[PDB]
Design a protein around this ligand. Sequence first.
Ligand SMILES: O=C(O)c1ccccc1NC[C@H](O)[C@H](O)[C@H](O)COP(=O)(O)O
Length: 243
Amino acid sequence: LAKRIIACLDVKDGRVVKGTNFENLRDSGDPVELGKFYSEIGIDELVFLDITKTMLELVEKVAEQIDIPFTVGGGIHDFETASELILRGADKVSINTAAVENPSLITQIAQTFGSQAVVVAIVAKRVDGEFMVFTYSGKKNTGILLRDWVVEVEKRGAGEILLTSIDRVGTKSGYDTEMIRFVRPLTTLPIIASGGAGKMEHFLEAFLAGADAALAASVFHFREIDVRELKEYLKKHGVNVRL
Ligand SMILES: O=C(O)c1ccccc1NC[C@H](O)[C@H](O)[C@H](O)COP(=O)(O)O
């Protein structure tokens, strides 16, 4: 099964939170324009993340303009919101804090739209040598061990785990490959590595650690990595991608 490259677009009020400077692009803040561009250059999937209704309009336009899978995330707190996002064209929804506080939400979405529709995002940090699950964008220690939550999440019916290591996020220092390795034998689900990507070699390392997809925002936002070059590089180094 081919490894996937996934671009994460941070969105506020249905616009991309710029500093973008895509001169080739007409409007760097239009998420449909930016998403379509990524689609065309070889990105395999998109994640639209609301960092703060306008989301429903965004999903609508994205759905009819873009022909690759896309996930929506960021403050989905209930079944009704997930349902509405999926019906209006989102392929997947990502939930985190709302999954920790009501794990049945996972199962409710999976039963209604299929397991492949639910992505559970997990933010973990090291606390006294143990990986612990944090909610509220890394503000709250749930007291839940990463090793138990991963097992609960699959059991509840999740289709994928988006594995965010908050202490690598934005740093460009590499993915947290130790955490990916820790999670790999605990679950059979596809693991999406998230946070830290800085150079092509970092993607290789994440795939070697056992990720099935690698998500990045910084290196695609700051235009640092050519997607096609990245795919050729991974292929050259024995990683199965699609070209
Ligand atoms: O997804 C969240 O709510 C969240 C939570 C805690 C810490 C970061 C969070 N989101 C940030 C995104 O997941 C972030 O864009 C990705 O991890 C990719 O980051 P970079 O590629 O390092 O720029």
